[PDB]
Amino acid sequence: ATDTGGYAATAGGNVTGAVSKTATSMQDIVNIIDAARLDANGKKVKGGAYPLVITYTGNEDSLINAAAANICGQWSKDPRGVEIKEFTKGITIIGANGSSANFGIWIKKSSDVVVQNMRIGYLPGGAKDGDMIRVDDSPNVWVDHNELFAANHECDGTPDNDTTFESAVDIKGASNTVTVSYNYIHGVKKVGLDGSSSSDTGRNITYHHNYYNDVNARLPLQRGGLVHAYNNLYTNITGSGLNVRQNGQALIENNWFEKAINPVTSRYDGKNFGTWVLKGNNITKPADFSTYSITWTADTKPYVNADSWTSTGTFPTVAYNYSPVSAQCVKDKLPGYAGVGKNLATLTSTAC
């Protein structure tokens, strides 16, 4: 079974011949992956020698709590993260209930990677690429049921005044198919890119059943390609939501928006506006803006906001299978399915 409910179709390390290992710290993860590259004779095998299912049981609450207490002290620290580079055998990193991490997971030139049930927050190194989850040149990645958090705040005197904290889920390069689902993302200024530059366009990404609260921007900052966002709960968006750029196409269906500024827009380039297809959201017409506290602002450069709340383009036939519940049901039920400690539970219409 490789159904993620989105463009990524992967089972990760849960394939045949998979080796299960328990990691009790960031260092164990690093060592476990390194050992997974050696064959029976001790020789390195390209892409990995065998599939892995790493159960992380470590807990770095102390680090997280200390950081939460002094958020402006984080950006200048050394970044901390486990790099999953060129590992294609299939790998799943799943956190044990109660586990926690003050380090990120950086996926690079790999494929078939699943990251589940990890609580990652307040990472050091916002000024030196300290991302929580990064997907670079990596197709078939599934980021599901995690809690990614920090503080939605910018400290004074940080480089570019944009480095207090890095991103939650940045996706770039040839990460052609990715599914980001059931994540509880909160207190994050820059949620996640979809293309690192104007020239970094493409990919097919699905964002479904995520609960975003108190986030400033990039849900995602899309550059070209296709994005399918369904059954997400968007609350307290302080900057802008889905920013569809460089002629990207997005299908936005059955989501719940509330207390949001510029929830669907195309700005910051002044040209090559992307398009969106809107359907089944709690918002159906502009009259609803007042009901759900949706505010719109302009930009210094030419932009397009969805203030008419109408579809501005088309969207290709959605390849995979999925059954969205109603926008009301996500608002009612989603917070109990998204995040860690939910036993990877999913929201079916039955539970609605």
Curated annotation (Swiss-Prot):
Active-site residues per Swiss-Prot or TrEMBL entry: R218
Cofactor note: Binds 1 Ca(2+) ion per subunit.
Statement: the UniProt record of this protein carries the keyword Calcium: yes
EC number assigned by the record: 4.2.2.2
Pfam family, one: Pectate_lyase_4
GO CC annotation: extracellular region
Keyword Lyase: yes
Transmembrane segments: none
Annotated localization: Secreted
EC primary class: lyase
Cofactor(s) required, per the database record: Ca(2+)
Substrates-to-products reaction catalysed: Eliminative cleavage of (1->4)-alpha-D-galacturonan to give oligosaccharides with 4-deoxy-alpha-D-galact-4-enuronosyl groups at their non-reducing ends
GO biological process: pectin catabolic process
SUPFAM superfamilies: Pectin lyase-like
Amino acids binding Ca(2+): D129, D131, E166, D170
Disulfide bonds, paired cysteine numbers: C72-C155, C329-C352
Pathway: Glycan metabolism; pectin degradation; 2-dehydro-3-deoxy-D-gluconate from pectin: step 2/5
InterPro entries documented for this protein: Pec_lyase, Pectin_lyas_fold, Pectin_lyase_fold/virulence, PEL
One of the record's GO molecular function terms: pectate lyase activity
Alphabetic keyword roster: Calcium, Disulfide bond, Lyase, Metal-binding, Secreted, Signal, Virulence
Annotated family: Belongs to the polysaccharide lyase 1 family. PLADES subfamily.
Role noted for this protein: Involved in maceration and soft-rotting of plant tissue.
Protein name: Pectate lyase C
